[PDB]
Amino acid sequence: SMEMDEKDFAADSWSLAVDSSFLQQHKKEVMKQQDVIYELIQTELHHVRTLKIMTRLFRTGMLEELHLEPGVVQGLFPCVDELSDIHTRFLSQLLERRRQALCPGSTRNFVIHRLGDLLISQFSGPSAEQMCKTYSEFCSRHSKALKLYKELYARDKRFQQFIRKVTRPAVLKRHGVQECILLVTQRITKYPLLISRILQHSHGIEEERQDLTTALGLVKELLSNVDEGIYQLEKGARLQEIYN
Amino acid sequence: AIRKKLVIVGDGACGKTCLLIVFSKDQFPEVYVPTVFENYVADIEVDGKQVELALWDTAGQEDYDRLRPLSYPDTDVILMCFSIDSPDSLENIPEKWTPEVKHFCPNVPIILVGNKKDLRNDEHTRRELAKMKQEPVKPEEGRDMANRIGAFGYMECSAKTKDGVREVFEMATRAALQ
Ligand SMILES: C[C@H]1C=CN(CC2C=Nc3ccccc32)CC1
């Protein structure tokens, strides 16, 4: 991620991110809502950072430094380009909404009043259909990717030296090839936990409460559709095994 | 520094995310208690052995039966959570979670963790439960369940007051090493 956005999301909460003289000007309920909204953008920035590691560091690193088929690299990181474009666009609209909410003469003090319209747009229409289709594919190829990684690491010396080398810096501690795959898979289920806690503290403006109410139903409908279209793929699974 | 994977399972209101946050931060979050837990690699040295313990959560996955098992591959220790102020969460342990964990993680040790032990001696908590013909989970009830389900251990902790949290994860590291 870029240095501008890391510093903007370095603090543990919105009440720590904003200037203490600006925090003092607000109600308790507003700070509570803003802490939960900040968590959504902070965890989305980290999710996008994870996907940029899988594509720029893992995927492209293997393509430009190792001698394995492009079908092997594809088996390791399925739909990473499709996911990275989906989440970078979602992050882009979240960060822009925050920037437009900043006070004149400030780069830290902001208050996001309208979020539901942004989440309704993301979790409905063609953007929702592209997430349903991409996550159903990713999560089906999830176990196949882990076995391919385990096979490769235990049988290729150059792949082992590549992995040990790129995952050596302390900042990559939580981001292995397998932790990245699980981090992506678990992300979709984090949205109804965050949207329900924002909705819990958004009862002041009735329009915001109903928009978040709708956005939460859109996420649950999307999650139900992703889950209903999952069927684990196995490398070298016979046709007889699949119809049994 | 051998790498081991720990996964925490349980009902939504059992307090599993809180436990994982309090351990990783090592401090009760003074200003904001986070909604979600992504992952964490804990540096733990139990009994002279250095182990990196990856900490995972199934929170949010409880209703998604074909999404939840994608957290189970390569698990070394399972922490089976239940709330002490919710006796119905303990009842769900042998008939919902236990068949599922033993199917996807065969031969992986399970530690029965009763969270929120502070609420066992809480006024409002005992008062609410009495209004449904109930009381908080007693120590012998948790131990009996841990035995009945074939758990490696039964432990109790309070994520709020921090009592017993360090030892759950040092014992988990030990179970993962067997
Ligand atoms: C241990 C402290 C942790 C949370 N505090 C309340 C708080 C501050 N920000 C928010 C946002 C949403 C919900 C609750 C809060 C009080 C106690």
Cα torsion angle, B153, B154, B158, B159, sign: positive
**Which of B95, B96, B43, B35 is closest to B68 using CA atoms?**
B96
Question: Quick one: tokens of B74?
Answer: 């390569």
Residue-range definition of the domain harbouring residue A135: 1-244
- Say if the Cβ atoms of A39 and B36 lie within 8 Å: yes
**8 A C-beta contact, residue A127 and residue A93:** no
DSSP code string of A2-37:
-HHHHHHT-SSSHHHHS-HHHHTTS-HHHHHHHHHH
Vertex A88: Cα angle to A177 and A210 (nearest 5): 115
Tell me whether residue B16 is annotated as binding.
yes
- Say if the Cβ atoms of B35 and A194 lie within 8 Å: yes
Distance from residue A10's CA to the centre of ligand 1 (Å): 18
Tell me whether residue B13 is annotated as binding.
yes
Looking at chain A from residue 143 to 162, which residues have their Cβ under 8 Å from any Cβ of chain B? Answer: 143, 146
- Say if the Cβ atoms of A139 and B70 lie within 8 Å: yes
Distance from residue B100's CA to the centre of ligand 1 (Å): 35
- CA A114, CA A111: separation in Å to the nearest integer? 9
Non-local (6+) Cβ contacts of B105 within 8 A are B72, B75, B78
Give Cα separations from A185 to A38, B16, B105 (angstroms).
22, 19, 19
Torsions phi, psi of A158, nearest 5? -70, -35
Torsion of CA A41, A46, A50, A51, to 10 degrees: 20
Torsions phi, psi of A131, nearest 5? -80, -40
Specify the CATH number for the domain of residue B77.
3.40.50.300
- CA B171, CA B117: separation in Å to the nearest integer? 18
- CA A176, CA A166: separation in Å to the nearest integer? 9
**8 A C-beta contact, residue A214 and residue A220:** no
Non-local (6+) Cβ contacts of A150 within 8 A are none
Torsions phi, psi of A59, nearest 5? -55, -60
- In chain B, the number of structural domains is 1
- CA B136, CA B129: separation in Å to the nearest integer? 7
**8 A C-beta contact, residue A119 and residue A128:** no
Give Cα separations from B134 to A207, B110, B121, B125, B150 (angstroms).
40, 27, 14, 11, 26
Helix (H) or strand (E) holding A81: helix A80-100
**Which of B52, B53, B22 is closest to B37 using CA atoms?**
B22
How many helices (H) and strands (E) chain A has is answered by 15, 0
Question: Quick one: tokens of A190?
Answer: 């984090």
- CA B38, CA A187: separation in Å to the nearest integer? 8
- CA A237, CA A235: separation in Å to the nearest integer? 6
Look-up of token digits 């002041």: A204
A200 touches chain B (CB under 8 A): no
**Amino acid at the residue A11:** A
Where does B68-122 have alpha helices with state H?
87-92, 98-104
Look-up of token digits 């780069």: A107
- The 8 Å CB, 24+ separation contacts for A17-22 are A17/A108, A18/A108, A18/A109, A18/A110, A19/A106, A19/A108, A19/A109, A22/A103, A22/A106, A22/A108, A22/A109
Question: B121-149 burial by CB neighbour count: b if 16+ within 10 A, else e?
Answer: eeeebeeebeeeeeebbeeeebbebbeeb
Give Cα separations from B58 to A143, A183, B10, B42 (angstroms).
17, 11, 8, 18
- Say if the Cβ atoms of A227 and B31 lie within 8 Å: no
Question: A63-96 burial by CB neighbour count: b if 16+ within 10 A, else e?
Answer: eeeeeeeeeebebbbbbbebbbebbeebbeebbe
CB of A36 shorter than 6 A to ligand 1: yes
Where does B7-158 have alpha helices with state H?
16-25, 87-92, 98-104, 123-130, 139-148
Closest CA–CA distance from residue A70 to any residue of chain B (Å): 25
Q: Which chain B positions have a beta carbon within 8 Å of A231's beta carbon?
A: 66
**Which of B3, B8, B32 is closest to B112 using CA atoms?**
B8
Question: Quick one: tokens of B46?
Answer: 């139990």
Question: Quick one: tokens of B15?
Answer: 């307090």
* Technique that determined the structure: X-ray
- In chain A, the number of structural domains is 1
Mutate to test the interface with B, among A12, A149, A189, A216 (most CBs of B within 10 A): A189
Question: Quick one: tokens of A63?
Answer: 């393509």
Residue-range definition of the domain harbouring residue B55: 3-177
DSSP code string of A108-158:
S-B-----HHHHHHHTSTHHHHHHHHHHHHHHHSHHHHHHHHHHHHHH-HH
